Each structure stands twice: as C-alpha cells, then as structure tokens.
C-alpha cells in the first residue's frame, strides 16, 4: 500500500517525498511538474533508537566518504563492504573484524536506516542563554515578563551560562555577582558596536556569562528589582527603544567570548525599535507603524534600512553558530518584519502576542524549555547538515531555517532553489519538529542525510539517514511515477516554493500554471470537454490544497499587519507535513446530538445552528455555537439537571481542544464565540476565484484546452 | 617709627625679634580707625604716587593683595531693603564717602553726588564698617540660589590602589558627612575612573548602590537621568555604604592607564545643570584619551633655567566649568611625574585650588598620610560659596591692569568664581592712568557676590582708603615690603611661563637693584629706607624658595605646586613659607603672653635664618606656616631629652616622630603652650614633626637657612654685596 | 511638556520658591518675572497665557502665585492639577509665614517637594490670553 509506505517512511526516516518513484529518463526528469523534493525532519523522535557510541564507518574514497548504511553490499567472508554510492570496496575497520552473519552491526539493519551516533572525544561545552530584556513597557507587563524569566531560569541546568542585557534608551550589559555593588556597562543605544569594539570596551565562563548554579541567586535578586527605563516619555511620543543596538551588542558579546558553540540569544521586546540602527518607526505617536498598504506605496522609509541591519546581525550570528529568539508582546506592531531574518536564518523562535501578562505567552514560553524522558531540553545546537546523493541526483537547494556553508561538489546542481549552491547547510538551532525542504534534480537511487549537532546535554551527535527510491521502469514511466505521488507533501513543497518567491519578490500565476500542467499530464480527460476531467486517488486532493493555499494568509498579505505575515510564514517554513497541512487547510469537526464528533468539510454548508464546531487552524482553536445551541446556552439549559446531555455537548469541543492545546509549541489562540458574535469572522473567512466548486469548474475548463 | 636710613652692610641684624606688623597708612586718626583690616585688604604702597611718572621712578610695583573670603570673628550684616550705591560707578556706600548736604553723599571713587534715600545717616552700619555683608535682592541673581553639590572623582588605577589614598578620603568623608556646608538641599555624587568611567546610582529602593560603566572614552555621556547626584539627607545610608565599600572594589585591579580627560568631561556633564564643587583625586600621568600627556624627563641640580602646559585641554575644560558655576579642585597624589603644569589649569581658571602629596603611600609615607588627613578635614568643613563673582573698584585715575589668582576674568574685569573658598588669596596690579592732582585720598573696594550654602545671595564688601603723595621719598616711606615681595612673587610666576625661569629670577633681582638705585640717586654703603630694610632679604628668600630655586634637586611637579601656592595663598602664608620663623625652644620661659587666663605661652625672640644662630647644645622650632620642624642638637641637654621628648638620649629618638608627647612636666607645658599658640593662628592645622635630626635624611631644615651659602646659591651677605655693586655702578 | 515652576508673593513679586533643570531659561524666567510684577488684586486668580511654542499656567491663592511653564502641547488639565498639589502643601507648611518674609527665596528648601511632585506629572506612564499682551 502506497499510503502505508508513506507513513512508515516518515516514522522511520523523518522524510516525505513529493515523488517516491523517480524518472529514469531526461525527458521525464525535465518534464516534471512538481520537482523531486523532500520534507526532511532531521531530529525526528521515534520509538527509542539505541544511541550508538562509536565513530561512523566511512567509505575509504576521498570523494565519497559516505556512511556505512543498510544499502551497502557486505561480504562477511572477505571482510569487505561495497559503497552503494561510489562502488568503492572497503576493508572493515579493525573493530569490525569479528562481525558475523548472525550478529551484524546496527548501521546495517534496515530498521536503522535512520541512526544516531554519539562521538565523545573533546570536552563538552555548557549551554548559553543570553536574556535581552526591553524595559520600555508597563509595570504589569514588565513584572509578568520578569516572572516568565525566573521560571525559565528555574529550568536551566546548573552548568548553563546566563547573561542579562537590559535596554531602552540605553543598553546595559550586566556583570553578575560582582558582590556588594551590582555593576553594568552602559552604552548609547544610538550607534552600532562591532564584536572587536565590544571586546575592547568590556575588557569556562566570563564576567558576563556565568553558571546558573553560581549566579542564579544574584540574578533572582537582580531580575526581581528591575524597573522601567528611567527616561521620561513626553506626551504623544513613543519610548526611545534601542532594539537594534541591543541585539548587535548581544550578538557581539557572544561572538568574542563563546563562538562556535550552542547559545540562545533570547530577546524580549514590548514595542518597535524607535532609535538607532534597525529603527522601525519614528517616535511620533501620530505617525502609525507601516502597513502592507504603506509598503506598497513607498510610504515606509525605515523598512529597507532596518531590514539590512538585522540581516547583517543574523548572518553574523549564523556564521558564529548562535540562535536568536524574538518574544514580541505589544498592542501595536513591533517590527517582526524587519527582524524576521534573525530567527529565520538561525533556527530561532518567533513568539508574538498582545501582552507578556497573558496565559498565552506564559505557557508558550515554558514550552520552549520542555524536557524529555531524561530531564534534558529538546533543543539542538550548531547543526551541520550534509547531503550525499547518487551520481544521477543533484541538489537544487534547501528552503527552511538554515544557511549555506557554500561547499561545492558534484552533488551541487546549477539550477539553484532557495539556499543552493551547496551540499552543506548550517542550522544553528533545531528541535525534533524542525523540518527542511530539499529540492532535487535528476541528471534504485539513494540519498544520505548527515546531521552533526550539539545535543542539549553537551554530547556531539551525528544523525545519519539513508533512503532509497526505485527508478521508473522505462516500459511504464509515467504510470509508475504517477502512483508514487504524495499529494500532501507536494502541496507543502510547492507552497514552500511560492512563499519563498513571494517573501523575496506573479507568484499566483506560477501556482496556477503548475496546477494546470499537473492536470494535463496526470489527469484523465478528453480534449475540450471539462466534464470528462478526473484525477486519480493519488492526485484528487491536490487542487483542493492549491485552492486554500492561494487564498491563504501566506500569499494574500493584505488584511494582516506586516508582522502577522512574517509570523505566519515563519512557522510555516519550519513545520512538518501534518501541521503544515493544517495551516493551509484547517481541519473541521462537528458536535451535535445526532452522533459522535466527526470530520466535516470546510464549507458554509457545515455551519449548522444545532451544532457545535471545532475548527483547528494551526494558530487558533475555535468553538462555534450555532444560532440554535447558542440560544439554548443563553437560556440556561446547561445548568439544569434535566440537561446533563446538553453539558456533554457544550464541553466536548472544549475537552478535545485542551489535548492539542498543550502539544503545539506556539500555544494556539483559544476562541469561543457563537452566531452573532464578533469572533465568528475567523470561521466564516476560513470557510467555503470564488468558491471551491467555481474553482474546479474553471480548472477543468483550462485543463482540457491548450497546453 | 622713624624715617631713618639703613646701611645693610653694617646692620646684618636688621630683622626684628617680634612679628612684623603691616604698615599703618599716613592717614588722619579718625580715617585710619575705620580702615579695612590689613589681613583682608592691603596695598604695596600705602602712600599712592600721584602720577605714573612718580610710580615709574620708584621702580616698585603698585598693586593690591586681598583675602576677601577669610573667616572672620565678627561680621556685620546689613539686611536693608535697598542697598545704597552710587548712581554712576555702582560703588557701595562706605565709611570713606563724604556727606555734605546730609541728604546727599559724594562718591569717593567717581566724585558724583548721590541722593541719600529715605531709608544721622553717617551712623548707619554701612558707613561705620569697612567690612560688611549685604543681603542681595532678587536682581543680583541670574537664577534661583543653587543648592550645594559635591561631586568626588576618584582615580582607581593600579597605581592609585597601591597608594591607598582612597581609604583615608572615604573615611574622611564618613567622619565629616554631616559637617559638609549646606541645608537639606545638599547633593552629593561619586565617580571612579581608570580606562573607563564609572558612575554610581544611589536609590533607597535598592539593596545596594549600582555601578554604571561608560566605556566609550571618545564620546562620554550621562547614563542615568537621576540618582547620580543624590540628596545627601535622603540617601545618607546609601552614601555611607558606598563610602565603606569603595576602598575594597579595586584591590585586584590590573588597569595601569588613566583616562582623566574623559572622566572630567563626564563629571562636567553631570554637574553642568547645577554647578558646585568637583573634587578630583589623581595619582599619575593621564595617558588615555583626550587630555593625555606625554612623559617628561626630570631635571637635576646641574640643569640651567631652560614650565608651561603641554596642552590647552584642561584650560579649555576649566573655562567650560567656569561658565556653569563648577569649580574643580585637584588632589595630586603622584609618586612620579604627572605634568601638573597642565593638570593644574583645571583649577586655575575655575576658581579651584590644587593640593599636592608627592609620593603618597599609606605605609611608606606617614607624613603625607597625616597631611592629607588634616587638609581634608579643613577642605570638607570650611565654609563655601557658590556661583560667585567679584569686582574690584578703585578711584578714578587708578586702573587695575593685571589679575593674579584662581578665577576667570570676564569682560570689563569681572572675576568669575564658581566657588569661593575661605583660604584663597588674590593679587592685583594697578597703575595711575590719570594724575591724582585733584584728590589727596583714594579708595579701593572689592565686592564679593555669592550664594551661601544655605541658599542666600550675599555680598561681602571691603573698602580700603589710602593717601596720595607727590614725592619719591613719601612713596618709599609707605612701602609695604611683604606686600611688595608677594606681588613680585606672583609677577615672577607669570614671567616663568611667559619667558623662562631665568627671566623670572633676573626680574626679581633687578627689582631690588632698580628700586634701591632709584633711592640712592634721590639722597658709601648700601643705603636703604627703613621701610625697605628687609627688601633684599625677602627677595633672596624668594630666589631660594622652591618656586624659583635653581641648583636644587627640585622636580617638575614640585616647582609647579609651589607656584600654585604663590598664586593661590594669601600673603601671610607666602611669607611664613618663604621666610620661616626661627625660635630657640630648649629654654622657653615666661616673658610671653601669660594673659590668656590659665596659659603662659612663651614669646621667644625671632631668630634670623642662619645656621650661625643655631647651636648643637639646644633645640630650635621652625615655623614654615604649613609645618613646624623641631631641630634638636646632637649635644642637647638631658633636661630637654626626657622632660620634653620623653627620651633618655639622642640615639633613641624615634626616626618618624609624628608629634610631641604631652608629658607631665612644666617643660613639655611651655613648649606645648607656645606651639598651640602658633597653630591657633591659622586654619590649616600645621603638623609638627621632630623628625628633624642631625642625620634623619629629612633635615631639609637647613634649606630654610636662606642667609647662608651653598654650592649653588649666594649667601645673604654676598647678596647684599652683589646688590651694592649695581646700585652705585 | 517639560518644566519651569516659580512661587512668588503677588503683592511685590517677591520670589518664594522655584525649580529649574536644563540639562532658553534666561528669556522665560524674565517673562515669568514680568508677570509677577504685573499681577495685583484685579488679576484673574486662574489663567493661562500663550507664549508661541510655550505656555504659562498660574493660579493665585492667599496672595501667593503658583506659576508653571511648559511646551504648549502639555495638557492644560494637568498643569492646574500640578499647581493645586503645590498650593495645598505650600499653604500648609509656610502659608502663615509668607506675609512676613522679606528675603528673596526665603523658602528655597521647598525645592524638594516641587521636584518630587514634578516627576509625577511629566511622565505619561481659567482664562486664555497672549502673554505678550499682558506684558
Ligand atoms: Zn563511497
Ligand atoms: Zn561713584
């Protein structure tokens, strides 16, 4: 079963391809509508693999150097194995001299095609957490943020290194535990400082990055005595907030002290940058922060200059190997558009809310520090992803949280996509859910993913994934290929391409041409008869995905603030297939007396009055109470003991929500409205050119005519 | 008295045995009785020459020396709703005005008749006192009275930490924290600096003071808008905790460079809105940032007279502080050359004052440790005035043309004094612009407008009246030799910078030659008038003082500080230092002033500064103003060793003997009674050390024997011989 | 929306207490002293004066004038609330000694309360006339 095959290969290998059978001819490889591409989750969790504590056996060919894997031919009599990539015959290392048929090494078993090695040879470094706190906010928000930080500090390992930078008009680098005085280094939040300058002006652990165990108390007393930025804010002005200079100092501090080691730069802002480099908006309250409408008409003079400043910081931190998180809670916008590159180029988080003093932020922030079955954080650091392919496969590029190491090779393709021109990428921070998108080009076949990273425990680890896919039998080329199509993965992989071209600017015209081309190649139809068009079970859901994709907030950015667009796109470019589908097309459920809850269509023909819906967009969990149940609820039938069944109904969607409302990292917003409520717009806007039926009619008309 | 003529070659003992008193001007009995106290306001010529030609013939400088803010025993204060001033020259009404119409008075400076306001008018306190203080009305202040603000700036480099000065300074601030002048408006602040600048926030809401570091040296700023200059009353507990903590914050420092320049710019920015007193403590050459100074090789005894600042940075900065009513006091505790010739400019042009402690160390130099202790006690407790201005008015025909002292001269000869301290002395040089043929009396009036430490605008006024004479002989008869020496000393310091030390010394010698040569032509030996019998002696003492000496091992910072003392101290302490008082004290008795109730206070006769007056059989006390040095002969009597020193022999006298023991003897009573009478005449407590011995390697006692000869300087008799060869050339 | 506060005796324009912080002042402190001289027993006890970019607000109570200056965009509502906080305290502490004093700024030490009350208004977290006319 092709469905069982796709499921079992995502569980075992953390990969999902658009095509699971690959073209063997240049004509088909060039005429490929959706490219051969993969949704790849390098650190996916699985039923408890054994961590293997020895060096990976490498192929002894200087060019290849592929890792021993279950696709290699092994002769247990001659103590030889043949590389599946370059065909080099290899003598076993001295340690493998005793391996046998009835007892063979783990890297050869097909269930360990995905496998993790532990390499213990050098002294392990501790984790580094640098707090960069904004003080230009209300006392309720500052106190609530202080409470969130003390909770995160209470979860860190004792050997973890912590630093504190506070900023507003100025930027203060605090020297912790100086005993009796509590000192800090004050800088103008008006001019930029380089890593060398900051090193000279300031003078394993530093005076600024101290172990939690030796400092947590002095921090707790400092973190609890913090106060508003003392500079007065005149009437009708925004506070002078030096976010850009505060970040460059935080970046510069770690670059000259702990380079090439895992570190989190956690930045907490309560408004936009209003001064210095990276400034997003002026300090005039009468001048509103730029909107997408303002971006289009060139009425936003700070966007281009502010973006260039944060792109320099992001590339400096990705080169050094550090992570930058943005935790932005404010009523108005905050500049996530100009700062998006810092958590996007690195593997950093982007959290966005209306106030740090909410259950939404407080719970989202502690999800960052979720531990596993061994009390260890679920974060990885300084990842290096290398991909090796058969000589017929070439790499176009990657889309996702990564940065090129610009390592050329025969696997590197000319036609480059996203972050291309390389077979190696750096991912400064990753989680078990971090998902990349690698695009391939054909010029059985095998691909090997090698991810070396720093575990949160300090151990150096290498994750190796070797997969294989059949070459298309030439006597049934397009037939075998068509049955291997993964419409779910292809839709997300094509959405990945569209968002990337839109966020680095028609994109809808490209999406429409590729959908029609896919219909004309893999669909059944007579010419000029739209009634005759059908799709196989393999392709039937793809048009419905494109319909929601081209209408989604990822591509129709008006009706959203520029920050909301960057936030949505940030979380879509990092998520796996299951969550990415929910973003594109929300899943809907229904709750009425007539039967258990069921998955229904995302159509206005499901908005019943006597029914309770449970819609799940990735960012929102909504529970709609139709005009009938909303009246029974406004009446008071629930409290009556005669209507305990009317209590199972109004709380069943609230029961199923909490389960998923605690797993998703950015805790989705919880909404409860009914017919007539002003919050039902989120349901009516995600529901329904025009509608899906009208969309399909036009698609069938274009698919059966000229190509 | 006597208008006699003296042959200095036959006397050679012309120094009296009693302290010199300032000359009384040849004035009428009723006029002189009202005249200003000579300690406050005095002139070099108590009889003013009528013409500039007469003054030029006398070859003596015409000038004033004033100590206008000196502590007084009794000060009349007039709180009149209106201050009667002349309508033309704004001269305050004074004892020497002339009431004719009884409702009209004639100004004694511009001769205009003024109307006496409806507010015996000659019985008014304004007419009965030459020294008086007024209450300034609202028109005499540019802003509300500024509060007292005290900002202390400490060097905490590695060298500064080794000296250990911070411990005494912080401990002295603790002991005198409630004695700082000011009311509840008093503000205080602290700044430390090495290669970076450190501010200190003081908030009661915090467990401890916070240290804010500004490391951008080329672009300094104020890191916090508040809690840096704090109200001393409200933050008393926090200021105390910071003072108790500072000496221990930098024990293991490795910073060897000092950014003095940028630290002063920061301190200026902090004090700029209010003004006040800025106390800078520096221990080494500034080498980092603006205001950095190059090292300079010291001279030796073989060096000829071949002074000036290296940069105008600290002069430009002082003028910035001056315009903001900020006075900078410089405490230099350096063991190596720190270029005081440049750093001192920060105090000269901001009405501050410099204090020097060569080779300060909390263990190796117990002398400088106690000296800083005593000087800080007076510095922190003495009275003070803020945002002050002084004007010197003189009768029409006379014109001030040169000022001497720590201040900034504005347009129309307005003396800007950000602070006015009660230990500062100023000197002025004037000339006769128009012949005084009309009048026979002239007057001089200094007015000191300032803000008291309580927030009251006050005006202290002194008026000095002097007669006008028309002969050479009358100008010589009224010559004030000490005032002349004081003015010449201030004039030579300017000549040192403008020309060289060689020219300054020549101008001092030529001052005596031309003056006496003018006298000789107007009358065999060296004949001088009685008023100038001590003129060659005092000028010779100037030439052997540390400011102008030549063949000595005096170092650069040493000489500059001596010149700072010449420019800043009143006359009385210039003389005490230049020509110390010598008494034999191993045989004190009861010819003294046993009038002060229950204490005798012997009055031994003043001896001249010659070793020929000493004796290896006795002990002698030397009063150099700032220090009392007690030289005990190798063959001193056993009665003086045990009954005064407490020792059984000369060989067991402690080498650093920081003072005298109050033994239970009448011997240790008379000497402690005579010493106590000497140190009660001055505000800066003079430490007495008997360390002076025949061989302590601290017997600079002999340096003050200015009448004797050495390998590099003439003796007194040789000096007179040198003078005589020129007066009759 | 900055600061300049002066308290004076209306009969003679005698300064009582003030509070000024720069880091100009010479022009507006002059005008504030021209106003203190013009005020008498016929003047409005509550008024607001327009000085181009600046604006004077004052109240007169117990023969004592409480005057503030600020940029015109500062809320007129808060200016009089601030002056009311000063009057109640000053009248309570020195109100019975005002008609007896003669020195200028005989109550300088009221400087403290003016400034601790001042910061409570310049931080967001009656008659109208042109001052040039009155002068
Ligand atoms: Zn190979
Ligand atoms: Zn006159």
Author numbering:
A (entry chain A): 3 to 205, 225 to 464, 476 to 537, 541 to 723, 746 to 764
B (entry chain B): 346 to 464, 476 to 662, 666 to 882, 888 to 1093
C (entry chain C): 1 to 23, 29 to 130, 148 to 157
From the paper:
The packaging of cargo transmembrane proteins into COPII-coated vesicles entails a direct interaction between COPII protein and cytoplasmically-oriented ER export signals. About a half dozen export signals have been identified to date, almost all comprising short peptide motifs, all of them binding to the Sec24 subunit of the COPII inner coat. The ΦC export signal was identified in studies of p24-family and ERGIC-53 proteins, and comprises a C-terminal signature of a pair of hydrophobic residues or a single terminal valine residue. The ΦC motif contacts a site on Sec24a that is also the binding site for the LxxLE- and DxE-class export motifs.
A series of ΦC-signal peptides was synthesized, based on a core sequence of yeast Emp24p, and individual peptides were soaked at high concentrations into two crystal forms of human COPII protein: one comprising Sec23a/Sec24a•Sec22b, the other Sec24c. For all ΦC sequences, we observed clear evidence for peptide binding to a site on Sec24a in the Sec23a/Sec24a•Sec22b crystals, based on the presence of residual electron density that matches the peptide sequence (this binding site is occluded in the Sec24c crystals). The finding that multiple classes of export motifs bind to a common site is surprising, but the COPII•ΦC crystal structures highlight that the common molecular feature is carboxylate-group recognition by the clustered arginine residues of the B site—the terminal carboxylate group of the ΦC motif adopts a similar position and bonding arrangement to the carboxylate of the glutamate side chains of LxxLE and DxE motifs. Thus, specific recognition of the ΦC motif involves the terminal carboxylate group bonding to Arg750 and Arg752 of Sec24a, with the penultimate hydrophobic residue of the motif nestling against Tyr496, and the terminal hydrophobic residue fitting to a pocket of hydrophobic side chains.
